[PDB]
Write a protein that binds this ligand. Structure first.
Ligand SMILES: Nc1ncnc2c1ncn2[C@@H]1O[C@H](COP(=O)(O)OP(=O)(O)O)[C@@H](O)[C@H]1O
Ligand SMILES: Nc1ncnc2c1ncn2[C@@H]1O[C@H](COP(=O)(O)OP(=O)(O)O)[C@@H](O)[C@H]1O
Ligand SMILES: Nc1ncnc2c1ncn2[C@@H]1O[C@H](COP(=O)(O)OP(=O)(O)O)[C@@H](O)[C@H]1O
Lengths: 426, 426, 426
């Protein structure tokens, strides 16, 4: 039906960090941190303390639902699984979708529907652009299973940048998503340019890993293991330089500006010492231009120490700067239209967030000011006409696009594997 | 069976001082002071006076059973064996378990069962967290031998802090056991955190040894040798300072407040003189924070005199404060949950008992008020939100947890050496 | 000059345990156990007994120089500072470099130079790969101060694995250092692969801490506090299993093979009892593969007891096996060359030492045989072609590389912070 959509059209975003979800009726979507928590090796002592309903399905997911079941850090680095490592779950990983299943299951269960006119939801999923074929097939399999439990009339999937352009309803610009895992820049002329869509393998999660290194170098290593901890630290102590080299010089001259103290929990309060105060810049900068002799040295000597198993989640080989990303995304649109499409740049998603702490504007920079000054370095003639803008409520964006897309996607259009578009029915 | 448990589930605690025991049916457990009494070198004169049944097994154990067989102090410091010196019996000591055997034998024999429906007990043992592997294997060997005498259907063992958390059924807090021998602090989130469990090697028995030194300095040394004597003295004359340095200053200014007279027996009545009246504080304080230039001097110069053999049971090297213990136990749980788990602090066990004698509240402090003020000194930001509580009937606690754990521990779960959990059958 | 180098080129290694040092002229370097001994709280009684020269600088360092100033164990666990806890001194610790200063000062003072042609030394320092930026800057500050005292023409610093590859002058292999604090595995093709260099945070010092636990479980705890004591015990009683599980099974079947008696001092002679005889394996094994349900249980229940302050120096979260370390270090070199570079494996450094005591070869294994059988478990196809070798004089190695590197490092090459290579001049 039609007005049936304005109620029961149900958007879902995944991305890496937060799974943003809700029906179209919401003003802004509810969030679930993507982490699933396994309950797997349990001393029968603790199984006595777990409700047999929760332990039955073998996981728990959601912000509040997991917090209650969290044991010590050793438990966290084991049984707390962040699937969607970057935008994507490796096929071979059974634990990867096992959480996504009950993460998606948690999503719908959160919103019951009393109305007997309810024929089942309309589930608009927004995956990352990097999502391969199997990740589509896998997640439709997920919602096919929830069809037996919940009422789902139809399921669709849209690439994440497609949502944002729909969310902004912007006519001419290059969308840039700050997605935690991946940065997806797409130009849009009258709509997405699928050929010009460019999605980096880098994201906010690379700002964690550059923080997760700092907290190891300060001797907080117990804190590093817990991903929530570096999150709070990164978000609080992370900072974006105007120009990295000029900034680090500044922070080594007058560190007292940059020394910060973050209270994670009453026991553990992270003090960024006087010396490393300049490393605050590497935290927020590595999202944008992770090519510098200053970072690429600091990341290299931080790749040496291998604590548990992982060598660290980050790439030593170097990536493309989001300045160079936007440019590369534009060379794929037509020279006719490039003057128009390169006018606006919409920054969106999480990793473009950073707010300059007050009084520090002479050195730090907002994500907006960063991109604008990033273009001046590479393509000067471009940065003249560029008006770069950050979305209001950056991370809520993709979901707002997911429902609008999900709202108008004529329901007689079947999902066909070849076109990778349209509804599928259970 | 099931309702069979609500009767014949049988909890046993050991700990150092009192072995707390009984079936689940009891309101509070019966106690046996852990002391075994050897009858070993007996002039045939006295063997004539001993029933040949008692002398046959070579020991006696229990409060009333030993009192009748106690000879002079020389006999007490010899043939009265306190096993479980701290939480643990050294493997090499045959006398150590030989008492525990007949101490555990005394425990079950105390409770005969008339009902022919009785298939044997369910013995839930609570050992100290410090109990090594052999101490588990040794005590199962004990109950395997009592299987031939008594009816024991199944035997299990739980670490002592696991009991308390079950006894309190507290969801978020850090348990602190005042166990006579050892202080075992564990955080609990939905249940014990085995990684965060921290057990000090210090306990109430270190408050004896600091009293046992005082009674030597007052010239009562005949009284010191008898462990029951310092017990009654410690419990009566022992006291817990608000702040040790401020307190000792007070007690040296106005000693008449603190001069006390304890009647042990009609012959021997201990008068804490006017001078040492300040040493009452070191008695109760050394349980909490045994690092002070005032104690660590007094314990050092009291380590010099070596009377019989032992140099004294106490550590000159210094230990961790229970304030620092709780903190160290929290750094092992996840920064996510630390805000919640650090809220409540449950004090339990014997060594957190002390009651301020009336009118003295301006200087002394209850164990509760002591811990709360202990945290303010170390981790100020923690002590703001901390609500610290003492268990009603502090020492009875562990047993109450031992039965509940012993009540539900599904009986098809075998004891497996690797997991160190579950029932074993004889 | 040139031939001036063949005399006055002066190598210095730090590492954790032994600081190996000497001029290039030596056959093998002289050693200094890294321990500094503070003289800090001294009763004026003892200051009368200390030469005012020694007490002036406030420390003493060196094997013989400290032995003479050692008081009781309480003094040792306080005023005997092992800096470089693992490979690294925490910035905030003033006591950390204060020893390194006079430790390095002790080093040069040991070797006076009579020749008036002597223009000052050439100091080649070998730090650990984990050495951060500040640890470089700190130690150059050290040698800048010794420039006023001694004659130092030039100072350089090389990462420790760089030395070994130079010391061996091996063309194709993966160096593995058994460094007391840390295990640094690097592949070398025509030289070090800085990207493939992988340095574990585990080392011989984790074999102490697993012995330091054993000596607490045997009741020698007075002996545990003294790091020299566990050293001699570890080196003597420590043993490396062929396969840990198969070995522990063997040692619990026939303990009389493994019961050992080590004479530390005429008073104290450590008898590893019959029972724990199997724990000899955990001593030497935890260097290699500290992931086992057998160790990771024994280390966990040994982390509970906290004696003085420290919870114990060791990581409960688990580390990477040196088998998996070598593999992870190879995935960073190019698939073209991996066939060649994975041929030889040079084991080096202290923690790869262990000699099977005679007649026990059926169960124990040399460090060589251990690594070779370690690879067979993980990467079978690799272990076929692998020829693994241990350096002759394992621990002397890094210094031998330090001088050769220090010998040819063209002196017109300045130290530049960015490249982290080359000479600096005072
Ligand atoms: N105030 C902030 N400053 C810096 N980074 C932030 C801030 N708030 C959120 N973030 C980052 O944004 C990320 C959220 O992005 P997200 O929408 O999950 O991307 P996607 O869902 O596409 O993977 C978080 O992982 C976090 O690291
Ligand atoms: N009123 C009191 N004041 C101070 N200490 C007390 C008091 N009552 C009991 N105690 C101490 O508590 C101890 C009992 O603790 P207990 O339960 O035996 O510990 P565990 O059993 O774990 O070893 C006794 O040794 C005694 O010293
Ligand atoms: N025979 C031996 N058996 C086992 N371990 C040994 C033996 N000899 C020395 N070791 C260990 O080797 C270590 C020396 O390594 P070292 O060269 O100090 O490493 P680094 O200097 O890189 O820190 C000592 O700490 C000791 O524990």
């Amino acid at each position: 039906s039609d007005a049936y959509r304005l109620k029961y059209t149900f958007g879902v975003d995944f991305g890496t960090s937060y799974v943003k979800y809700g029906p179209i009726t919401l003003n802004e979507p509810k969030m679930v941190q993507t982490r699933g928590l396994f309950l797997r090796d349990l001393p029968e002592s603790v199984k006595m303390r777990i409700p047999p309903d929760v332990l039955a399905r073998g996981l728990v997911v959601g912000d509040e639902e997991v917090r209650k079941y969290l044991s010590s850090v050793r438990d966290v680095q084991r049984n707390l699984k962040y699937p969607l490592k970057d935008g994507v779950a490796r096929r071979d990983d059974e634990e990867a979708w096992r959480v996504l299943k009950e993460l998606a299951r948690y999503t719908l269960a959160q919103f019951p529907v009393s109305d007997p006119e309810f024929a089942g939801w309309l589930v608009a999923v927004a995956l990352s652009a990097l999502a391969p074929d199997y990740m589509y097939k896998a997640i439709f399999d997920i919602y096919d299973e929830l069809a037996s439990e919940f009422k789902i009339y139809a399921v669709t999937i849209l690439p994440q940048p497609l949502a944002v352009a729909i969310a902004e309803n912007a006519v001419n610009c290059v969308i840039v998503e700050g997605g935690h895992g991946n940065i997806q820049v797409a130009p849009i002329s009258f709509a997405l340019i699928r050929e010009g869509l460019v999605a980096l393998n880098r994201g906010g999660a690379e700002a964690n890993a550059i923080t997760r290194e700092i907290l190891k170098d300060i001797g907080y290593s117990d804190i590093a293991r817990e991903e929530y901890a570096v999150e709070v630290v990164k978000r609080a102590v992370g900072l974006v330089p105007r120009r990295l080299k000029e900034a680090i010089r500044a922070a080594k001259s007058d560190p007292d500006r940059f020394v910060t103290k973050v209270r994670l929990s009453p026991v553990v309060e992270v003090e960024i010492p006087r010396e490393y105060a300049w490393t605050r810049f590497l935290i927020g900068e590595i999202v944008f231009d992770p090519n510098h002799e200053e970072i690429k040295s600091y990341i290299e000597q931080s790749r040496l120490r291998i604590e548990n198993a992982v060598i660290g989640d980050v790439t030593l080989y170097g990536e493309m700067d989001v300045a160079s990303a936007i440019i590369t995304s534009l060379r794929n649109v037509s020279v006719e239209i490039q003057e128009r499409v390169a006018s606006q740049i919409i920054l969106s998603g999480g990793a473009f967030s950073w707010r300059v702490p007050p009084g520090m504007e002479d050195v730090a920079a907002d994500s907006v000011t960063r991109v604008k000054i990033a273009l001046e370095e590479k393509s000067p003639a471009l940065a003249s006409k560029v008006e770069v803008r950050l979305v209001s409520e950056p991370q809520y964006s993709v979901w707002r696009g997911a429902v609008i897309y999900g709202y108008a996607l004529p329901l007689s259009l079947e999902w066909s594997d070849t076109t990778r578009e349209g509804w599928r029915f259970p």
